[PDB]
Amino acid sequence: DIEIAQAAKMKPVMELARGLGIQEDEVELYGKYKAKISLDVYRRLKDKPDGKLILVTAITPTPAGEGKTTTSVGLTDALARLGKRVMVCLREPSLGPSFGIKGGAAGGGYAQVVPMEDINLHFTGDIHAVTYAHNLLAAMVDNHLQQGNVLNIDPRTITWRRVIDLNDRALRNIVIGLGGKANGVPRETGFDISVASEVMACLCLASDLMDLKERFSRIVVGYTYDGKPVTAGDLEAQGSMALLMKDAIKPNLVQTLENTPAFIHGGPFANIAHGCNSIIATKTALKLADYVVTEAGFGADLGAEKFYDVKCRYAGFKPDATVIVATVRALKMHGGVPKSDLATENLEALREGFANLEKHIENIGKFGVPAVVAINAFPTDTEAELNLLYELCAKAGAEVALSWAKGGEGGLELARKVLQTLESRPSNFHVLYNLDLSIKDKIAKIATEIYGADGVNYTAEADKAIQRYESLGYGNLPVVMAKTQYSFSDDMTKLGRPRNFTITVREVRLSAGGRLIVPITGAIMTMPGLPKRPAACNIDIDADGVITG
Amino acid sequence: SDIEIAQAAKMKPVMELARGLGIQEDEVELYGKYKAKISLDVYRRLKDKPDGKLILVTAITPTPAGEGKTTTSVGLTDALARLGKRVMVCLREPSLGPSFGIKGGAAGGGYAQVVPMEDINLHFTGDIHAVTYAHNLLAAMVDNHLQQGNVLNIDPRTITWRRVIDLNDRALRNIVIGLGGKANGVPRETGFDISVASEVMACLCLASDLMDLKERFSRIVVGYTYDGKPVTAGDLEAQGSMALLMKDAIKPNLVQTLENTPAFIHGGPFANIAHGCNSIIATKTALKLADYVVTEAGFGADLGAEKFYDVKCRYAGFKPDATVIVATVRALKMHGGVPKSDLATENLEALREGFANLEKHIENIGKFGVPAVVAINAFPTDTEAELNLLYELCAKAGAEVALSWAKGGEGGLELARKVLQTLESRPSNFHVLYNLDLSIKDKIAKIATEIYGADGVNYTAEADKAIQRYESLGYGNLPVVMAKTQYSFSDDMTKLGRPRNFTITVREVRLSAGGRLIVPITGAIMTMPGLPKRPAACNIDIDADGVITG
Numbered sequence A: 001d002i003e004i005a006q007a008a009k010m011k012p013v014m015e016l017a018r019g020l021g022i023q024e025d026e027v028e029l030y031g032k033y034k035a036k037i038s039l040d041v042y043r044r045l046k047d048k049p050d051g052k053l054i055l056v057t058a059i060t061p062t063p064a065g066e067g068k069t070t071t072s073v074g075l076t077d078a079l080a081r082l083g084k085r086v087m088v089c090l091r092e093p094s095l096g097p098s099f100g101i102k103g104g105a106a107g108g109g110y111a112q113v114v115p116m117e118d119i120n121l122h123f124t125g126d127i128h129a130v131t132y133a134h135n136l137l138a139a140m141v142d143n144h145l146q147q148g149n150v151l152n153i154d155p156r157t158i159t160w161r162r163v164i165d166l167n168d169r170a171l172r173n174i175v176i177g178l179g180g181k182a183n184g185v186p187r188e189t190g191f192d193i194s195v196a197s198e199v200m201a202c203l204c205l206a207s208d209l210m211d212l213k214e215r216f217s218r219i220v221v222g223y224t225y226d227g228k229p230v231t232a233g234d235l236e237a238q239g240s241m242a243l244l245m246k247d248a249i250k251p252n253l254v255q256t257l258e259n260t261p262a263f264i265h266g267g268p269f270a271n272i273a274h275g276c277n278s279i280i281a282t283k284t285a286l287k288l289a290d291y292v293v294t295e296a297g298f299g300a301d302l303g304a305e306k307f308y309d310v311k312c313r314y315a316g317f318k319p320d321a322t323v324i325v326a327t328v329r330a331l332k333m334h335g336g337v338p339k340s341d342l343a344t345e346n347l348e349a350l351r352e353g354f355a356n357l358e359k360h361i362e363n364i365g366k367f368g369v370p371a372v373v374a375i376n377a378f379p380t381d382t383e384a385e386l387n388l389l390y391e392l393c394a395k396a397g398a399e400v401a402l403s404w405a406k407g408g409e410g411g412l413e414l415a416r417k418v419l420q421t422l423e424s425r426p427s428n429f430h431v432l433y434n435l436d437l438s439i440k441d442k443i444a445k446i447a448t449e450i451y452g453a454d455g456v457n458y459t460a461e462a463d464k465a466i467q468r469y470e471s472l473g474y475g476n477l478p479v480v481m482a483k484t485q486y487s488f489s490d491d492m493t494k495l496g497r498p499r500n501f502t503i504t505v506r507e508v509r510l511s512a513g514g515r516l517i518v519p520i521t522g523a524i525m526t527m528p529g530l531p532k533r534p535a536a537c538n539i540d541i542d543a544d545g546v547i548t549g
Numbered sequence B: 001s002d003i004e005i006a007q008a009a010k011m012k013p014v015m016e017l018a019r020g021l022g023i024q025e026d027e028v029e030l031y032g033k034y035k036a037k038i039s040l041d042v043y044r045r046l047k048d049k050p051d052g053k054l055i056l057v058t059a060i061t062p063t064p065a066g067e068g069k070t071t072t073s074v075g076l077t078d079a080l081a082r083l084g085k086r087v088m089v090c091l092r093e094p095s096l097g098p099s100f101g102i103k104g105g106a107a108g109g110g111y112a113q114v115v116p117m118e119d120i121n122l123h124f125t126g127d128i129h130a131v132t133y134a135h136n137l138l139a140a141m142v143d144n145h146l147q148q149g150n151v152l153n154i155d156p157r158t159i160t161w162r163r164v165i166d167l168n169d170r171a172l173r174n175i176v177i178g179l180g181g182k183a184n185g186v187p188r189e190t191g192f193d194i195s196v197a198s199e200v201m202a203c204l205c206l207a208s209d210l211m212d213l214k215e216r217f218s219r220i221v222v223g224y225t226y227d228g229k230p231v232t233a234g235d236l237e238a239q240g241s242m243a244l245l246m247k248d249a250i251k252p253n254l255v256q257t258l259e260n261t262p263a264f265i266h267g268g269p270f271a272n273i274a275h276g277c278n279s280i281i282a283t284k285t286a287l288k289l290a291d292y293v294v295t296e297a298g299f300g301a302d303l304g305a306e307k308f309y310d311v312k313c314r315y316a317g318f319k320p321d322a323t324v325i326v327a328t329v330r331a332l333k334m335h336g337g338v339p340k341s342d343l344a345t346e347n348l349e350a351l352r353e354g355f356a357n358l359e360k361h362i363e364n365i366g367k368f369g370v371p372a373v374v375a376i377n378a379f380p381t382d383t384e385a386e387l388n389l390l391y392e393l394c395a396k397a398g399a400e401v402a403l404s405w406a407k408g409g410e411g412g413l414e415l416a417r418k419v420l421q422t423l424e425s426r427p428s429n430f431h432v433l434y435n436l437d438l439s440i441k442d443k444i445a446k447i448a449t450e451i452y453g454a455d456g457v458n459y460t461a462e463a464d465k466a467i468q469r470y471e472s473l474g475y476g477n478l479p480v481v482m483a484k485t486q487y488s489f490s491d492d493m494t495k496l497g498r499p500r501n502f503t504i505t506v507r508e509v510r511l512s513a514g515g516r517l518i519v520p521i522t523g524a525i526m527t528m529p530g531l532p533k534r535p536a537a538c539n540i541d542i543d544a545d546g547v548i549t550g
């Protein structure tokens, strides 16, 4: 009965490709229902007009669940119904979690992206391609050391770890290169989940296969003995890294349960990285559709700011609308109601928890972009609970989305407000900070105006880090804040709209292909682990079809 | 010329070739216009139909001078199609790693190639990723189990199951895992072998369908308890999941020769620590779609041909009909003592002396009841006097010259004709070299004695313990898979030719419970090769889309 049990009624992607004016020759199929679209679609429609861009985001995440993706597909079906040319772009899910805790649908209920099972697994192999690009580089680093260490690297400062797309704890901290002189140079490193890879990040912000080629070459792998940074470039790896990505580069065309054309392509981390689907997918989509709907990871404080300040900045996008999702269950949790008690109506809690969404809204304001709230409706979520909220959004447009349950017909109301927004409410999009400010000034501008901290503190380790980067010349880059998503602040316990608090950046990491990363805590969760009773244990496939994936 | 001839190839859509073979559209799964996975439904509905003839191609003891196995197989297949035969060639998928180290070598070679080359050499249909991730999921599961209070009671120090990656990465040979304290796993020594060396890959090649492969996984031994009881993947309830990751990898991939002859590429394991053959699934599907099926085996005939007969044929009921054994003048002369550099110079004496290597392989193939035909892979430097002596010399077997590299199928016409002729007048009487119910040590001697011409076999203490342990754990009625050097009949790689008065030494014996017993000689321990000083990775680029060199 769950979102899986809606495996039913897909149209061959090939014809969809025609329903968009993609030529047959620009389609590399993967069976009938997955295909890869060439980057030629953009290059021949280079100068055509762009359709409108519709970033869906969410309020501060909670154990209550909200529903970005679900609402995003539903936003999409609904626009379909209204005879508009409308595409979605989503992120590809890591394989890892299918076997751990997760194993879920792209969206949900009646607003899903299909075929569900391929998307979760080996899809079109975009992640294996990231994986090999990463590990090849790692290999070249180590081989070089084996080969006499011409570049005079300090093995002890390699910051290039290896990658794999499984929840594997036991690979977090490892020692390689043992066995003697035949078998490499001993050093300490680890693995991270593939999707966390700088290479996954580059895929997602590259203009094209040559932009990818360059960004790879910019990547720092570690430093030499007299502190001079070695690069992917220095190791002549970038060419090979690109070859491995020859196909990953192209976006994947798929569909909605309601046959609405979808791209899913790329999938970065939302803290350590910016957490948007790829730029290739969205700029391509813009030329095939009048209305593109896309999303970002975590809450609008992280995903959206990074959407605007990273993704739009680089790609010359000018977001026209922005939806923000919220649930009643969730806000009550922001009001301080435990996860056990969500069943009960609590109009006073929802009133207090609303402060969260209220801040988020002010932040979408701050970007010169037309906000609109959307509530994913729930079985427990009552009429006085909804009414209390609907009026509480007395500041910016609100609608209810019965999507998870009613399909495109349930996000019919919601899509109206958006289209009314896009016709009557023009945009004035502008990045929050300026790329010539100070790493600190930049962080500060994110902390105060977006989160609402009074100020920012820095550790000893954080300053000699910053120092080095400014003076290594990497100070002109944007800032991608690695912090807990569960609060505006870096204190996860502090839900709602916390006031009179500061932000402390413990460390600073570089991503030379892209931008600058300031961690707030152990965001060190770049490799999660399997649970006591993992899903692998119960996954099976009989003499035909799958139980429990 | 220019062995990226695979550009101008002119490929027929695979779908077209498939319906050409009698495959329905619903049994075809496109990967672009030129690649397809093919349902196991095709075999099922054609189970009752008769097999075509099976032709194995193998070669003489490999050398620095090169021999030409695959080129000859594709070349044969094409020569057969030009003769109007309904034919298929089945080949192994290459590992990705060699592409960035030394190779990125030809689909098959010269005018004998299976294409799309580039994709065959890189991700192809992603069968190797499926193997990598099935294999590592087992590993990750092993570790987490230790991490979760170790109910099954594994001694982590006894875990034989390593990790895997499809790159030449020596630094991953010996590593220490699970560091950082109570939260980060349990410290233990392991390493990574190259993906294609995975037992998960050997299983794929030896499986009959997804259920048997799923079963084979449940028997995989990962380690031992504190008490010495074996612990298996079944015991970790992992086989379902691994099976899941192989849902598509289980289907063979349809592709074509430069001449549009259909071809299957599927699986590609090692030929020492495994049997170096492509998958039973491809081959068995090809026997029902085609009147003739050409396939090959890794290394020389003493290893790959042996294992093809004694492992792959054993499991599948195949009865090989003929065998094409590939040799060159230049390699034979090396075997007769000529150094790599002086190979162009005419030398009928070292040719005569080196022929002993070829003679022996012929003799061996004889021992399975399958008639042999030699293929001479012509080289421009070979004199008439030379080639001619090589024929006189092949006194026992059909001989021919293959010009398959230079002249496509047409160069294979002579060979093709010799095979068809053997097919018609000299039916095989196939039988494996050994019964399963001998002991490990008896089986080994059969192989070492009969096929290597070894005097006998010696064993170290470690070998003796291992064989005693495996036999009492009940794995002693299984086939034996010799991992030795391929550069020699002996396990001294420097003994070329047909060495005599020699002895094999088994140093260490390992178990693959998705099949059988692996017994190593030297450092055939090399299950994770390394990158050279100047790796091909450094001189690879892409521009407009012009993939330069590799």
Ligand SMILES: Nc1ncnc2c1ncn2[C@@H]1O[C@H](COP(=O)(O)OP(=O)(O)OP(O)(O)=S)[C@@H](O)[C@H]1O
Residues within 6 Å of the ligand: A058, A064, A065, A066, A067, A068, A069, A070, A071, A104, A105, A106, A107, A108, A109, A376, A377, A378, A379, A404, A405
């Ligand atoms: N209106 C609804 N009624 C019932 N369940 C819902 C509803 N909306 C979402 N869900 C469930 O909430 C789960 C995920 O909620 P979240 O993870 O907060 O949303 P998300 O992280 O943006 O990704 P999703 O699954 O597309 S909402 C999904 O597995 C859905 O099954």
Ligand SMILES: Nc1ncnc2c1ncn2[C@@H]1O[C@H](COP(=O)(O)OP(=O)(O)OP(O)(O)=S)[C@@H](O)[C@H]1O
Residues within 6 Å of the ligand: B062, B063, B066, B067, B068, B069, B070, B071, B072, B105, B106, B107, B108, B109, B110, B377, B378, B379, B380, B405, B406
């Ligand atoms: N007349 C010829 N001139 C030049 N090269 C030739 C000629 N005939 C054969 N070859 C070689 O045949 C080689 C083909 O190698 P493959 O067939 O891919 O490997 P294989 O021959 O199946 O087994 P190995 O590993 O090479 S011993 C090419 O690399 C060529 O160098």
